[PDB]
């Protein structure tokens with residue numbers, strides 16, 4: 584997260600770190616046995632780490648569970664990152680409490696202007712690589728569709744939205760992909776891509792979760 588602040592230990596209890604010897608993406612807990620992340624964060628050997636804050640120290644509250652299966656959206660396009668969503672099922676269920684809780688899926692899409700919280704252990708520099716130890720947060724709004732499309736002509740589909748600041752300075756960055764964008768207590772986005780981090784007029788693009796709720800629901804119901 585570039586230009587964000589330290590969330591404070593376990594203040595984002597639905598945030599998960601996907602680990603394969605190190606942290607490579609974030610994700611969101613939506614129920615006791617399922618996480619939602621981004622399709623390009625797919626790999627085998629994923630351990631989902633819950634109740635974290637410093638990802639390099641065991642501080643207590645952590646639950647480490649292995650993924651039983653990951654489901655990449657079938658129409659995921661790696662060249663356009665259209666449909667960049669993935670569901671990970673956990674081997675056993677997580678123990679929910681005040682430090683590990685899930686987040687509700689939206690019933691309606693959010694409107695431009697809506698302010699949301701984006702979190703993650705990603706890079707904090709736009710020009711360089713500095714990965715933090717504890718979780719970072721950034722409050723950013725959803726932009727209108729015309730600004731998004733005017734920033735990324737020909738690269739935004741209806742399953743994507745831009746959120747951020749056009750003046751630059753604040754944005755999600757690498758290490759944040761897969762993580763959440765929660766607005767009014769509903770998961771409205773997943774960190775998907777961007778051009779650099781915190782650059783001027785190049786806001787971050789997020790996968791539009793309101794467009795996948797029936798799919799998340801039906802897939803989870805059948806697996």
Ligand SMILES: *[O-]C1=C(C2=[C][C]=[C][C]=[C]2)[C]=[C][C]=C1C1=NC2=[C]C(C([N])=[N+])=[C][C]=C2[N]1
Pocket residue numbers: 607608623624625754755756757758759760774775776777778779780781786787788
């Ligand atoms: O996410 C990502 C990755 C990556 C590839 C494959 C698996 C896991 C991660 C590699 C490089 C960069 C990124 C990435 N860049 C980026 C930029 C923004 C932004 N500027 N808003 C958000 C999220 C990411 N991820």
Ligand SMILES: [Ca+2]
Pocket residue numbers: 635636637638639640641642645
């Ligand atoms: Ca830790």
